[PDB]
Structure formats: C-alpha cells, structure tokens
Amino acid sequence: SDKPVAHVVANPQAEGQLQWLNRRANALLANGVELRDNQLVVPSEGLYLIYSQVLFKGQGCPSTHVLLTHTISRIAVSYQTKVNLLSAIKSPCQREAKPWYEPIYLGGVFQLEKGDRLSAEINRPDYLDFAESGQVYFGIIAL
Amino acid sequence: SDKPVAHVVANPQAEGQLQWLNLANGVELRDNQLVVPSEGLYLIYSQVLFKGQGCPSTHVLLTHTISRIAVSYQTKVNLLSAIKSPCQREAEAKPWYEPIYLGGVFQLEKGDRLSAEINRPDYLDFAESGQVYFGIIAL
Amino acid sequence: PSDKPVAHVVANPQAEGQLQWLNRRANALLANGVELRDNQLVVPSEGLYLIYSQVLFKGQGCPSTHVLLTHTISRIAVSYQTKVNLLSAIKSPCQRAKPWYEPIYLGGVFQLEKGDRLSAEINRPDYLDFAESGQVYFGIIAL
Numbered sequence: 001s002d003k004p005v006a007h008v009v010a011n012p013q014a015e016g017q018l019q020w021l022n023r024r025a026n027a028l029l030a031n032g033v034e035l036r037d038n039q040l041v042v043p044s045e046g047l048y049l050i051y052s053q054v055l056f057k058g059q060g061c062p063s064t065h066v067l068l069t070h071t072i073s074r075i076a077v078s079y080q081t082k083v084n085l086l087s088a089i090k091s092p093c094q095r096e097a098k099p100w101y102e103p104i105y106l107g108g109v110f111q112l113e114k115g116d117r118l119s120a121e122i123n124r125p126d127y128l129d130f131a132e133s134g135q136v137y138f139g140i141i142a143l
Numbered sequence: 144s145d146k147p148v149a150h151v152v153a154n155p156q157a158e159g160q161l162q163w164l165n166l167a168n169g170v171e172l173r174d175n176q177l178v179v180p181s182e183g184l185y186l187i188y189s190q191v192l193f194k195g196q197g198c199p200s201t202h203v204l205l206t207h208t209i210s211r212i213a214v215s216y217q218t219k220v221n222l223l224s225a226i227k228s229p230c231q232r233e234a235e236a237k238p239w240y241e242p243i244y245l246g247g248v249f250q251l252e253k254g255d256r257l258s259a260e261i262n263r264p265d266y267l268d269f270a271e272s273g274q275v276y277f278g279i280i281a282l
Numbered sequence: 283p284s285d286k287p288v289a290h291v292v293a294n295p296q297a298e299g300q301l302q303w304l305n306r307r308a309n310a311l312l313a314n315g316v317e318l319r320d321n322q323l324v325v326p327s328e329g330l331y332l333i334y335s336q337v338l339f340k341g342q343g344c345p346s347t348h349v350l351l352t353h354t355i356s357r358i359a360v361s362y363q364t365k366v367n368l369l370s371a372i373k374s375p376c377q378r379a380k381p382w383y384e385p386i387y388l389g390g391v392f393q394l395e396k397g398d399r400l401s402a403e404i405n406r407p408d409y410l411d412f413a414e415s416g417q418v419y420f421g422i423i424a425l
C-alpha cells in the first residue's frame with residue numbers, strides 16, 4: 001500500500017508548547033508524509049481524512065472566563081494560500097478549587113494538493129495535558 | 144485496478160433536514176441511501192455536526208445512526224449508533240457545537256441499502272467545528 | 283475478495299458491568315487472520331493498521347462530585363508483553379436522577395508487529411450502555 005498516512009503526537013520534552021513528533025511508541029510518518037516546522041507535508045494530490053484531538057486541564061475557575069481553541073489550517077504552495085479547514089472554541093468555566101477537563105476533537109475529509117502543509121494549533125499550551133501517552137494527536141489518512 | 148467507493152456530503156440548502164449529495168465503481172446514491180454494488184467487506188463511516196442556541200434544559204439528546212436495509216428481508220438494522228447529551232447546567236445563552244463520528248467494517252451484500260440519520264435535523268450545522276458526510280469504501 | 287486482515291468486534295450485551303468483545307454475532311467479524319483471544323485483538327502480520335473504537339456511557343443523575351470517563355486503546359508488545367497506550371480520551375459528564383449520555387470515538391494509524399495484542403478498555407464499565415446494537419465496537423484494518 002502506497003497511500004500517504006501520518007499519526008503524530010504531542011512532544012512531552014517540549015511542555016508549554018504543542019510541538020508534534022512522530023514518537024516511537026504510538027506515532028509515525030509513512031509513504032511521503034514529512035513533518036516540517038511543526039506541520040504535516042502532503043506528498044500528493046487527493047482526498048484525505050484529517051483529524052486531531054487535544055485535551056486541556058486546569059485546576060479551578062478563577063479571574064475571568066477562559067477560552068480554549070483548536071485549529072487545523074492548510075497552506076498551499078501556490079501564493080502560500082492559508083485557509084482554516086477546521087476550528088472549535090470551548091469555555092471550560094461557568095464561575096468559581098476542583099480540576100476541569102476540556103477535550104477538543106476535530107476531523108473531516110478534504111481535497112489536498114502536493115506540497116500542502118497542515119498545522120494543528122492551540123491558543124493555550126499552558127493548559128495542555130501531558131498526563132497519558134495518547135490523548136494529544138494529529139493525523140492524515142489518504143482515502 | 145479499483146474498488147467501490149462513495150463519499151457523499153449533506154445539502155446546506157435542505158433546511159431542517161439531512162439530505163445527501165454526490166461516488167464510484169457501482170456505489171449509487173438512491174432514495175437518500177447508499178446502494179452496495181457487490182458482496183464484500185466495506186468500511187462505512189459518517190460525521191454529523193449539531194449546534195444549539197444555548198442550554199435551556201439538560202434533557203436535549205442528540206443521536207446519529209447508520210442502518211442497513213437488507214435486500215432479502217427489507218428490515219432496518221442498526222450498524223453504528225451514538226447518543227450525546229450536549230447540555231450540563233443552564234445569563235446570555237451561548238451556542239454549543241457537537242460533532243458525532245461513526246465508522247466500522249461490515250460484510251455487505253449486493254443491493255444492501257445504507258442510511259445515515261439524526262434525531263435532531265433542526266440542530267444540523269455546517270460550521271468548521273466539523274463536517275457533514277457519509278461514505279463507504281470497499282476493502 | 284479482500285486479503286487484508288480486518289476485524290469489527292462488538293460488546294456483549296449480557297456481560298453485566300463489563301466490556302467483553304464478541305465476533306460471529308449478527309454484524310461483527312474477524313477476517314484474514316485476526317483472532318480474538320483474552321478480550322484482545324491479535325495481529326497476524328507486521329504493518330500499518332487503521333485502529334478505531336467507540337464506547338457509549340450512560341448515567342442517571344450526577345453523584346459523588348465529578349466522575350471521569352476514559353477510553354483507551356493499548357498495544358501489548360509480543361516480545362516483552364509491555365502495555366503501551368496508542369489512543370486515549372477523557373470525558374467529564376457532570377458539571378456540578380436525570381439520564382446523561384456520553385460517546386467516546388477513537389481512531390488512528392499505527393505500526394503493529396505479528397502477534398501484537400490490542401485492547402480497548404474503559405475505566406467505568408458500570409456506566410457502559412450496550413442496551414441497543416452499534417453502540418460499543420472495536421476494529422482494525424490493515425493498510
């Protein structure tokens with residue numbers, strides 16, 4: 001099978017930032033997919049399933065009202081055109097100490113071109129949970 | 144060289160409804176259902192997105208189900224199904240977004256019909272927090 | 283006629299307070315070498331595998347304080363019998379006797395070895411909802 005695939009996970013050696021890595025235990029890059037400048041690089045044109053899940057965690061609900069965002073964007077090599085493919089906003093606090101857990105999960109099927117770069121970004125890396133092995137991931141599967 | 148596939152998307156113009164739009168190698172979209180062209184193993188998958196205005200009650204239930212209509216029985220059997228309670232606790236009411244995913248491998252027969260339905264089409268949304276699709280891929 | 287190892291297992295609706303996987307039932311299967319032994323899927327050959335699962339949780343009202351629901355897909359190495367997490371997700375169904383429903387869907391691409399055992403586990407089997415078909419399943423597809 002020649003179809004491009006990748007499943008990348010949060011690098012724990014880089015806490016305070018969401019840095020993706022093809023970690024040895026549960027992550028990989030195959031059939032042309034490269035990981036460059038924290039982005040997944042598409043080797044060929046076609047329909048791809050793009051997916052990601054991030055887990056935020058905080059202890060208590062103080063000061064004001066916290067906004068957690070997760071975003072998947074595409075950069076085409078032509079004109080360096082940047083477009084938002086998937087995005088989601090979540091507010092973990094309804095006034096207030098007890099810890100909260102806010103997962104954000106995104107996915108869809110998209111037409112990608114050769115050289116397309118895909119990034120998966122969060123606004124609050126300080127809330128990212130590095131507790132268990134595979135809760136923070138990003139991937140692409142060519143159909 | 145090739146295997147039966149379909150990737151159908153929902154119509155944004157079909158207000159308060161889940162209507163699929165077009166798909167290759169004999170996979171046909173007929174009566175808002177995917178038609179299996181030949182016997183074999185198929186990856187069946189779907190995604191729906193729901194959006195509500197706020198949380199006026201916690202009794203709101205969202206469901207999404209993929210069903211098979213067998214040709215030699217004409218019965219509707221559940222292949223994949225999910226239930227979600229989008230609201231916990233009830234101020235200016237803020238919209239919520241909830242995607243539901245389904246997917247599995249099934250042995251299907253020539254002429255089997257597959258439908259992908261939701262209980263709350265009034266909540267169906269086309270924002271970037273998800274996508275609205277249904278598909279089959281022959282393995 | 284597909285030669286690739288595949289499997290789609292479903293939960294036993296008769297195994298009270300447990301997550302026990304079954305095949306040969308109505309719309310479940312094991313094909314091209316995939317075996318079900320000790321509640322785990324057994325890999326027949328080295329390669330990349332599409333791994334997916336769904337569990338549904340149901341509770342009547344919100345007791346204790348805040349309950350954490352988790353779903354984890356693990357790789358049990360054939361050599362050292364080491365258990366490693368591949369995919370994992372957490373959910374907080376209670377936000378401080380009325381029923382709530384929480385589905386957890388996991389998916390990804392993984393490199394597996396011949397004889398690898400895959401498990402799909404949950405921390406609260408007492409909240410599992412298998413009342414109807416297609417609610418709780420686990421499966422693999424060789425690429």
Ligand SMILES: CN1CCN(Cc2ccc(-c3c[nH]c4ccncc34)c(OCCc3ccc(-c4cccc5ccncc45)cc3)c2)CC1
Nearest residue numbers: 051052105106107142143188189244245246332334389390
């Ligand atoms: C031999 N060929 C077979 C077909 N294959 C392409 C292909 C097509 C469809 C699916 C699929 C299954 N269930 C689905 C549910 C919804 N949408 C799509 C799917 C697929 O599954 C690979 C495993 C997988 C399953 C779910 C997800 C997932 C989908 C959507 C949001 C997410 C958010 C967070 N985490 C995970 C997400 C990610 C990977 C693979 C190419 C090779």
